[PDB]
Design an enzyme around this catalytic site. Structure first.
Site, PDB file in Angstrom:
ATOM      1  N   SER A  49      91.325  41.674 -40.620  1.00  0.00           N
ATOM      2  CA  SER A  49      90.727  42.980 -40.831  1.00  0.00           C
ATOM      3  C   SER A  49      91.474  43.920 -40.004  1.00  0.00           C
TER       4      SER A  49
ATOM      5  N   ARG B 220     102.885  35.357 -61.231  1.00  0.00           N
ATOM      6  CA  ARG B 220     103.731  36.015 -59.967  1.00  0.00           C
ATOM      7  C   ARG B 220     105.267  35.356 -59.757  1.00  0.00           C
TER       8      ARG B 220
HETATM    9  C1  LIG Z   1     103.821  41.833 -62.947  1.00  0.00           C
HETATM   10  C2  LIG Z   1     102.389  42.270 -62.828  1.00  0.00           C
HETATM   11  C3  LIG Z   1     102.213  43.847 -62.938  1.00  0.00           C
HETATM   12  C4  LIG Z   1     100.908  44.208 -62.870  1.00  0.00           C
HETATM   13  N1  LIG Z   1     100.791  45.777 -62.889  1.00  0.00           N
HETATM   14  C5  LIG Z   1      99.313  46.271 -62.705  1.00  0.00           C
HETATM   15  C6  LIG Z   1      99.142  47.525 -62.661  1.00  0.00           C
HETATM   16  O1  LIG Z   1     100.206  48.368 -62.928  1.00  0.00           O
HETATM   17  N2  LIG Z   1      97.680  48.052 -62.763  1.00  0.00           N
HETATM   18  C7  LIG Z   1      96.877  47.265 -62.470  1.00  0.00           C
HETATM   19  O2  LIG Z   1      95.694  47.685 -62.369  1.00  0.00           O
HETATM   20  N3  LIG Z   1      97.032  45.666 -62.655  1.00  0.00           N
HETATM   21  C8  LIG Z   1      98.395  45.304 -62.564  1.00  0.00           C
HETATM   22  N4  LIG Z   1      98.483  43.880 -62.543  1.00  0.00           N
HETATM   23  C9  LIG Z   1      97.218  43.160 -62.141  1.00  0.00           C
HETATM   24  C10 LIG Z   1      96.755  42.311 -63.412  1.00  0.00           C
HETATM   25  O3  LIG Z   1      96.108  43.319 -64.163  1.00  0.00           O
HETATM   26  C11 LIG Z   1      95.666  41.341 -62.942  1.00  0.00           C
HETATM   27  O4  LIG Z   1      94.634  41.955 -62.263  1.00  0.00           O
HETATM   28  C12 LIG Z   1      96.064  40.350 -61.981  1.00  0.00           C
HETATM   29  O5  LIG Z   1      97.524  39.887 -62.412  1.00  0.00           O
HETATM   30  C13 LIG Z   1      95.463  38.840 -61.787  1.00  0.00           C
HETATM   31  O6  LIG Z   1      95.366  38.430 -63.308  1.00  0.00           O
HETATM   32  P1  LIG Z   1      94.181  37.700 -64.026  1.00  0.00           P
HETATM   33  O7  LIG Z   1      93.148  38.700 -64.073  1.00  0.00           O
HETATM   34  O8  LIG Z   1      94.565  36.962 -65.152  1.00  0.00           O
HETATM   35  O9  LIG Z   1      93.661  36.567 -62.777  1.00  0.00           O
HETATM   36  P2  LIG Z   1      92.203  36.350 -62.316  1.00  0.00           P
HETATM   37  O10 LIG Z   1      91.400  37.718 -61.813  1.00  0.00           O
HETATM   38  O11 LIG Z   1      92.260  35.299 -61.046  1.00  0.00           O
HETATM   39  O12 LIG Z   1      91.465  35.763 -63.368  1.00  0.00           O
HETATM   40  C14 LIG Z   1      91.880  34.230 -63.934  1.00  0.00           C
HETATM   41  C15 LIG Z   1      91.129  34.483 -65.479  1.00  0.00           C
HETATM   42  O13 LIG Z   1      90.013  34.581 -65.405  1.00  0.00           O
HETATM   43  C16 LIG Z   1      89.597  35.568 -66.534  1.00  0.00           C
HETATM   44  N5  LIG Z   1      88.852  36.594 -66.213  1.00  0.00           N
HETATM   45  C17 LIG Z   1      88.647  36.874 -64.906  1.00  0.00           C
HETATM   46  N6  LIG Z   1      87.906  37.667 -64.828  1.00  0.00           N
HETATM   47  C18 LIG Z   1      87.464  38.180 -66.123  1.00  0.00           C
HETATM   48  C19 LIG Z   1      86.994  39.165 -66.648  1.00  0.00           C
HETATM   49  N7  LIG Z   1      85.975  39.779 -65.681  1.00  0.00           N
HETATM   50  N8  LIG Z   1      86.702  39.272 -67.939  1.00  0.00           N
HETATM   51  C20 LIG Z   1      87.406  38.554 -68.657  1.00  0.00           C
HETATM   52  N9  LIG Z   1      88.111  37.446 -68.084  1.00  0.00           N
HETATM   53  C21 LIG Z   1      88.119  37.333 -66.897  1.00  0.00           C
HETATM   54  C22 LIG Z   1      90.885  35.710 -67.473  1.00  0.00           C
HETATM   55  O14 LIG Z   1      91.163  35.073 -68.257  1.00  0.00           O
HETATM   56  C23 LIG Z   1      92.030  35.588 -66.024  1.00  0.00           C
HETATM   57  O15 LIG Z   1      93.219  35.338 -66.487  1.00  0.00           O
HETATM   58  C24 LIG Z   1      99.845  43.440 -62.633  1.00  0.00           C
HETATM   59  C25 LIG Z   1     100.009  42.028 -62.506  1.00  0.00           C
HETATM   60  C26 LIG Z   1     101.264  41.540 -62.669  1.00  0.00           C
HETATM   61  C27 LIG Z   1     101.628  40.143 -62.664  1.00  0.00           C
HETATM   62  C1  LIG Z   2      81.552  45.735 -44.181  1.00  0.00           C
HETATM   63  C2  LIG Z   2      82.190  44.791 -44.843  1.00  0.00           C
HETATM   64  C3  LIG Z   2      83.049  44.075 -44.154  1.00  0.00           C
HETATM   65  C4  LIG Z   2      84.134  43.140 -44.548  1.00  0.00           C
HETATM   66  N1  LIG Z   2      84.941  42.545 -43.777  1.00  0.00           N
HETATM   67  C5  LIG Z   2      85.975  41.453 -44.304  1.00  0.00           C
HETATM   68  C6  LIG Z   2      86.729  41.161 -43.517  1.00  0.00           C
HETATM   69  O1  LIG Z   2      86.929  41.303 -42.371  1.00  0.00           O
HETATM   70  N2  LIG Z   2      87.633  40.096 -44.017  1.00  0.00           N
HETATM   71  C7  LIG Z   2      87.580  39.822 -45.562  1.00  0.00           C
HETATM   72  O2  LIG Z   2      88.289  38.918 -45.865  1.00  0.00           O
HETATM   73  N3  LIG Z   2      86.580  40.185 -46.167  1.00  0.00           N
HETATM   74  C8  LIG Z   2      85.720  41.289 -45.710  1.00  0.00           C
HETATM   75  N4  LIG Z   2      84.877  41.828 -46.539  1.00  0.00           N
HETATM   76  C9  LIG Z   2      84.911  41.550 -47.974  1.00  0.00           C
HETATM   77  C10 LIG Z   2      83.763  40.743 -48.230  1.00  0.00           C
HETATM   78  O3  LIG Z   2      84.009  39.411 -47.785  1.00  0.00           O
HETATM   79  C11 LIG Z   2      83.830  40.286 -49.941  1.00  0.00           C
HETATM   80  O4  LIG Z   2      85.022  39.845 -50.276  1.00  0.00           O
HETATM   81  C12 LIG Z   2      83.544  41.630 -50.691  1.00  0.00           C
HETATM   82  O5  LIG Z   2      82.571  42.467 -50.145  1.00  0.00           O
HETATM   83  C13 LIG Z   2      83.159  41.403 -52.267  1.00  0.00           C
HETATM   84  O6  LIG Z   2      81.742  40.850 -51.797  1.00  0.00           O
HETATM   85  P1  LIG Z   2      80.946  39.909 -52.807  1.00  0.00           P
HETATM   86  O7  LIG Z   2      81.831  38.487 -52.806  1.00  0.00           O
HETATM   87  O8  LIG Z   2      79.468  39.601 -52.569  1.00  0.00           O
HETATM   88  O9  LIG Z   2      81.107  40.615 -54.363  1.00  0.00           O
HETATM   89  P2  LIG Z   2      81.939  40.093 -55.665  1.00  0.00           P
HETATM   90  O10 LIG Z   2      83.278  39.397 -55.559  1.00  0.00           O
HETATM   91  O11 LIG Z   2      81.900  41.208 -56.743  1.00  0.00           O
HETATM   92  O12 LIG Z   2      80.942  38.987 -56.179  1.00  0.00           O
HETATM   93  C14 LIG Z   2      79.417  39.217 -56.852  1.00  0.00           C
HETATM   94  C15 LIG Z   2      78.637  38.188 -56.511  1.00  0.00           C
HETATM   95  O13 LIG Z   2      79.271  37.176 -57.143  1.00  0.00           O
HETATM   96  C16 LIG Z   2      79.149  35.949 -56.675  1.00  0.00           C
HETATM   97  N5  LIG Z   2      80.565  35.422 -56.440  1.00  0.00           N
HETATM   98  C17 LIG Z   2      81.764  35.668 -56.901  1.00  0.00           C
HETATM   99  N6  LIG Z   2      82.731  35.113 -56.756  1.00  0.00           N
HETATM  100  C18 LIG Z   2      82.182  33.925 -56.216  1.00  0.00           C
HETATM  101  C19 LIG Z   2      82.698  32.813 -55.595  1.00  0.00           C
HETATM  102  N7  LIG Z   2      84.102  32.485 -55.909  1.00  0.00           N
HETATM  103  N8  LIG Z   2      81.922  31.762 -55.234  1.00  0.00           N
HETATM  104  C20 LIG Z   2      80.760  32.086 -54.889  1.00  0.00           C
HETATM  105  N9  LIG Z   2      80.212  33.264 -55.299  1.00  0.00           N
HETATM  106  C21 LIG Z   2      80.833  34.202 -55.966  1.00  0.00           C
HETATM  107  C22 LIG Z   2      78.698  36.268 -55.072  1.00  0.00           C
HETATM  108  O14 LIG Z   2      77.166  35.743 -55.163  1.00  0.00           O
HETATM  109  C23 LIG Z   2      78.919  37.463 -54.971  1.00  0.00           C
HETATM  110  O15 LIG Z   2      77.800  38.301 -54.108  1.00  0.00           O
HETATM  111  C24 LIG Z   2      83.930  42.867 -45.931  1.00  0.00           C
HETATM  112  C25 LIG Z   2      83.129  43.511 -46.741  1.00  0.00           C
HETATM  113  C26 LIG Z   2      82.244  44.506 -45.983  1.00  0.00           C
HETATM  114  C27 LIG Z   2      81.094  45.071 -47.137  1.00  0.00           C
HETATM  115  O1  LIG Z   3     103.108  44.007 -60.052  1.00  0.00           O
HETATM  116  C1  LIG Z   3     101.848  44.431 -59.906  1.00  0.00           C
HETATM  117  C2  LIG Z   3     101.451  45.790 -59.924  1.00  0.00           C
HETATM  118  C3  LIG Z   3     100.228  46.243 -59.481  1.00  0.00           C
HETATM  119  N1  LIG Z   3      99.392  45.273 -59.323  1.00  0.00           N
HETATM  120  C4  LIG Z   3      98.102  45.750 -58.879  1.00  0.00           C
HETATM  121  C5  LIG Z   3      97.741  45.614 -57.343  1.00  0.00           C
HETATM  122  C6  LIG Z   3      97.083  46.938 -57.179  1.00  0.00           C
HETATM  123  O2  LIG Z   3      95.586  46.754 -57.101  1.00  0.00           O
HETATM  124  C7  LIG Z   3      97.418  47.843 -58.208  1.00  0.00           C
HETATM  125  C8  LIG Z   3      98.573  48.959 -57.930  1.00  0.00           C
HETATM  126  O3  LIG Z   3      99.443  48.243 -56.922  1.00  0.00           O
HETATM  127  P1  LIG Z   3     100.909  48.494 -56.778  1.00  0.00           P
HETATM  128  O4  LIG Z   3     101.875  48.658 -58.132  1.00  0.00           O
HETATM  129  O5  LIG Z   3     100.835  49.954 -55.991  1.00  0.00           O
HETATM  130  O6  LIG Z   3     101.630  47.435 -55.950  1.00  0.00           O
HETATM  131  O7  LIG Z   3      97.905  47.273 -59.315  1.00  0.00           O
HETATM  132  C9  LIG Z   3      99.629  44.117 -59.173  1.00  0.00           C
HETATM  133  O8  LIG Z   3      98.671  43.260 -58.598  1.00  0.00           O
HETATM  134  N2  LIG Z   3     100.844  43.584 -59.486  1.00  0.00           N
END
Ligand SMILES: Cc1cc2nc3c(=O)[nH]c(=O)nc-3n(C[C@H](O)[C@H](O)[C@H](O)COP(=O)(O)OP(=O)(O)OC[C@H]3O[C@@H](n4cnc5c(N)ncnc54)[C@H](O)[C@@H]3O)c2cc1C
Ligand SMILES: Cc1cc2nc3c(=O)[nH]c(=O)nc-3n(C[C@H](O)[C@H](O)[C@H](O)COP(=O)(O)OP(=O)(O)OC[C@H]3O[C@@H](n4cnc5c(N)ncnc54)[C@H](O)[C@@H]3O)c2cc1C
Ligand SMILES: O=c1ccn([C@H]2C[C@H](O)[C@@H](COP(=O)(O)O)O2)c(=O)[nH]1
Ligand SMILES: Cc1cc2nc3c(=O)[nH]c(=O)nc-3n(C[C@H](O)[C@H](O)[C@H](O)COP(=O)(O)OP(=O)(O)OC[C@H]3O[C@@H](n4cnc5c(N)ncnc54)[C@H](O)[C@@H]3O)c2cc1C
Ligand SMILES: Cc1cc2nc3c(=O)[nH]c(=O)nc-3n(C[C@H](O)[C@H](O)[C@H](O)COP(=O)(O)OP(=O)(O)OC[C@H]3O[C@@H](n4cnc5c(N)ncnc54)[C@H](O)[C@@H]3O)c2cc1C
Ligand SMILES: O=c1ccn([C@H]2C[C@H](O)[C@@H](COP(=O)(O)O)O2)c(=O)[nH]1
Ligand SMILES: O=c1ccn([C@H]2C[C@H](O)[C@@H](COP(=O)(O)O)O2)c(=O)[nH]1
Ligand SMILES: O=c1ccn([C@H]2C[C@H](O)[C@@H](COP(=O)(O)O)O2)c(=O)[nH]1
Ligand SMILES: O=c1ccn([C@H]2C[C@H](O)[C@@H](COP(=O)(O)O)O2)c(=O)[nH]1
Lengths: 209, 209, 208, 208
Positions: C84, C174
């Site tokens: 952090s 990626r």
């Molecule tokens: C080249 C590149 C460019 C990008 N540019 C942008 C950008 O311009 N702006 C931006 O905002 N992001 C951008 N992204 C981020 C992209 O939109 C995704 O957030 C990120 O790549 C993670 O992908 P993911 O959701 O598949 O992975 P994860 O979040 O780990 O999800 C894993 C899989 O679980 C499923 N899943 C997880 N959560 C949900 C959900 N709530 N609803 C339905 N299915 C779910 C999906 O099938 C997903 O593939 C970019 C990513 C890449 C690789």
């Molecule tokens: C004051 C503050 C300080 C912080 N400091 C740090 C820091 O120093 N370093 C750092 O890395 N992060 C830090 N965080 C981020 C924190 O650890 C969480 O990643 C972030 O707040 C999202 O919280 P969440 O997982 O409860 O919410 P979400 O990701 O939205 O998840 C919602 C709920 O779904 C469940 N959930 C989602 N995914 C999983 C999973 N894979 N396994 C089990 N349960 C799941 C949990 O019950 C969770 O409460 C900080 C956050 C706060 C508010």
């Molecule tokens: O290649 C990309 C481009 C964007 N983003 C996501 C990360 C940020 O949450 C937001 C914009 O990031 P930047 O384009 O500034 O990297 O979209 C990615 O994860 N990968």
């Protein structure tokens, strides 16, 4: 009465190294000693920091859980399941002898396939249902996909279940409660008991109500 | 024979406004017309950007699904379900009449509680399991928590089900396949048919195999 | 940029799961050739790919930029614990000015900064870095305030844990040529840090 | 002072219907006096809090810092679509220099940066902004390299979708006095953007 094995788990130090990464406090580390264990417990239970517990992962095996209880376990979404499929394994019944008439021996035999509860009448009905299921498969040779419609919820299933420590805490809390189905309370207890003793302190208090 | 209703859905332009936010292409927007709709299909289908479909949400009501099918639907973790509980609702059988003998009248009566499949023998066993369950509940006054163990998987459930478009595409792709259970293929078609005609173009290809 | 795999689930955990579904334990070979190919063939059928979720990997990542951290955090099915800035910026209260931009101060600067293949960008990053240092040391500004002047090239450190199914998705997205270069580097460093024994499950993900 | 709009939300009657579906008790229903309080009551029982997941909110957020974005991104049970710095940074190629620092240019720099409660920090953000502008306009350096010189106070714009259950978690965690000020600001803004009828579901989350 259902069998739970923990087949693999994540060394605790993974968790403590993760926690120290956040504030870069490796200087205070004791190389996996009691102060490191203490840290996982104290920080892991501050809500804002409970995501550090997610680094601990557990691979379980569960045998002899009812389909009815599977319905409820399936609702915990933050976990991974691989479950014995009735669509592809029901033919296991083709090979067994009738469970009628009901009697001590046949009732014991049926427990291989059914979860019994603490009522004799209910259990008798499950066996009746199991017998009809056996007949559908064995004498009429009906496909699994159709026959499974006659299967009682007490029918036994088998699964690999994987879950991280934060989600496991949630599970243990919800399902060890007195509002929870008796079988799910037993599953919660059985999962706790399958944990390595060295990890059990992280979860010990979930079961407290 | 099963009914799915779409109670509420996110307007399509919500997704177009999100796509245009990434690359700041708000310049080429057209109130959500052919320029915006082409964009949703095109970009949202690009895997690295399928994230844009998650802004669309669908609230469904589903009637007449079996508990057997419910086991399979429950395994789609990215979705929200509220399900009729047998633990709380089984007293519904306490009032009704015997389903014996298995005449044509009692068969149809039994359909209100059971999903029938395309085999007369299976259905007959389902009805026999149903009558034993009614007996446990009505003649012996056994509690729901025990009696549910003698319940057949053909027993009807009822649920509210909400899901985003990205997850709904996954669900439809997986469950319209020839390898999916017949009831689940049927659920897939019904969910799709329940969608607003405007939205259907995002999902039509999911059903093509 | 340094990526280490601290722990990983044994392959046979995944093969036991697969065999559980169809009850095909008779045909097992105790994590041998067939068990290994089973994981690969079945794990890659989309309807059965949730079988790979049983394999979990714990990583340490050092030397990642806050910029790439923005992009890595977008993978929601994973767990991270991140150094952090709100708490550890104090690290700058000690060090000596990075001016003038001679080769000795640039070297010292890479301790805290991710350099790219442009000398001018790197110089700007060092200048942003020196102004951050100035706010912390000379003016004693709170971390929560001074952090707003932090450059996106500032180095971070994290524990990262992810399962095999999600890692396949991460590595595919990626290692693409559309990905930010540093993220391509990360994908490759994650693959390289996997046990040689597990790598056959992921290598096709990198193949574009 | 960031701008938060709720573009669409789910009618409350959708959660009351879902709740009633569990017990088959629609018989006593009316989204009237019974329903709205039903949702609040049952939603707040942890074992039944998943009934709240049926309520979905589509927001637009404008003027959030990249720094606050890092934190917001950590909430994984939500959907985000974010303005990409890798493609939109060309926005700076046109504007005039931000130097010298004066009341007028400080005002102009706010179009692109989030200012905090310290002038000295804000000045350093502008310095980094101006360097970023130079790399882009005078040196014609690609976005992918130049973004490394960007300060975390740089403004972003996003669409943000989240369900009631996850939003409760978000407001509780981010309205704490342990949270970054900007995040506390955002938590208040999201709450305020909620339709009045839904607010009673979240107001307690802000109370510590
Ligand atoms: C080249 C590149 C460019 C990008 N540019 C942008 C950008 O311009 N702006 C931006 O905002 N992001 C951008 N992204 C981020 C992209 O939109 C995704 O957030 C990120 O790549 C993670 O992908 P993911 O959701 O598949 O992975 P994860 O979040 O780990 O999800 C894993 C899989 O679980 C499923 N899943 C997880 N959560 C949900 C959900 N709530 N609803 C339905 N299915 C779910 C999906 O099938 C997903 O593939 C970019 C990513 C890449 C690789
Ligand atoms: C004051 C503050 C300080 C912080 N400091 C740090 C820091 O120093 N370093 C750092 O890395 N992060 C830090 N965080 C981020 C924190 O650890 C969480 O990643 C972030 O707040 C999202 O919280 P969440 O997982 O409860 O919410 P979400 O990701 O939205 O998840 C919602 C709920 O779904 C469940 N959930 C989602 N995914 C999983 C999973 N894979 N396994 C089990 N349960 C799941 C949990 O019950 C969770 O409460 C900080 C956050 C706060 C508010
Ligand atoms: O290649 C990309 C481009 C964007 N983003 C996501 C990360 C940020 O949450 C937001 C914009 O990031 P930047 O384009 O500034 O990297 O979209 C990615 O994860 N990968
Ligand atoms: C005693 C009891 C009675 C029950 N009765 C019923 C019933 O009558 N009808 C019925 O349908 N179900 C019933 N359930 C199931 C219940 O609604 C939950 O689905 C189940 O308990 C899993 O809880 P969970 O969501 O917290 O765990 P998980 O699904 O594993 O989620 C873990 C955490 O992640 C977060 N999370 C996961 N997904 C989301 C999401 N999509 N949106 C927001 N946050 C998310 C939540 O913080 C959650 O606590 C009952 C459960 C219990 C224990
Ligand atoms: C024909 C068929 C046969 C099946 N047979 C069996 C069987 O024999 N035994 C059995 O146990 N199951 C079986 N299943 C269930 C199957 O394994 C899946 O659990 C289920 O279909 C849900 O699919 P999903 O994980 O893609 O969807 P969701 O759970 O909704 O997930 C949506 C997407 O999010 C991502 N995601 C969600 N959670 C995780 C996570 N924890 N880790 C990584 N990524 C995640 C994945 O990308 C996934 O595609 C079968 C399914 C089908 C269609
Ligand atoms: O970090 C560890 C250490 C051990 N085990 C497993 C391997 C064995 O199956 C079982 C017993 O191991 P030992 O107690 O013999 O080390 O625990 C783990 O899963 N993780
Ligand atoms: O204690 C309970 C009660 C219900 N449910 C979920 C599982 C099913 O999807 C649905 C109905 O379950 P039963 O009451 O029929 O067990 O709600 C649980 O998870 N636990
Ligand atoms: O086609 C299938 C087969 C299995 N499963 C899941 C549901 C159960 O959790 C488990 C076994 O299901 P059945 O084969 O009994 O339907 O695997 C499905 O989701 N779809
Ligand atoms: O208050 C905090 C502190 C940390 N983090 C998460 C976000 C980053 O991924 C990482 C470090 O963030 P900063 O301290 O640099 O803001 O931990 C937060 O979400 N909120």
């Amino acid at each position: 009465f259902m069998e739970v094995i923990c087949k693999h788990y994540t060394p605790l130090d993974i968790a403590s190294q993760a926690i120290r990464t956040c504030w870069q406090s490796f200087e205070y580390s004791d190389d996996g000693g009691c102060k490191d264990k203490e840290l996982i417990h104290r920080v892991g239970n501050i809500f804002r920091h409970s995501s550090t517990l997610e680094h601990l992962y557990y691979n379980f095996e569960i045998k002899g859980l009812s389909r009815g209880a599977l319905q409820e376990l399936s609702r915990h979404r933050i976990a991974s399941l691989s479950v014995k499929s009735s669509r592809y394994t029901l033919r296991e019944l083709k090979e067994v002898e009738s469970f009628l008439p009901l009697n001590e021996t046949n009732l014991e035999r049926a427990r291989e396939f059914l979860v019994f509860v603490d009522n004799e009448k209910v259990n008798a009905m499950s066996v009746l249902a199991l017998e009809n299921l056996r007949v559908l498969l064995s004498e009429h040779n009906i496909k699994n996909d159709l026959a499974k419609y006659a299967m009682p919820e007490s029918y036994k299933t088998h699964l690999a279940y994987s879950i991280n420590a934060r989600s496991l805490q949630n599970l243990l809390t919800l399902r060890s409660s007195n509002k929870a189905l008796k079988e799910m309370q037993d599953l919660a207890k059985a999962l706790f008991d399958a944990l390595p003793g060295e990890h059990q302190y992280l979860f010990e208090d979930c079961l407290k109500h």
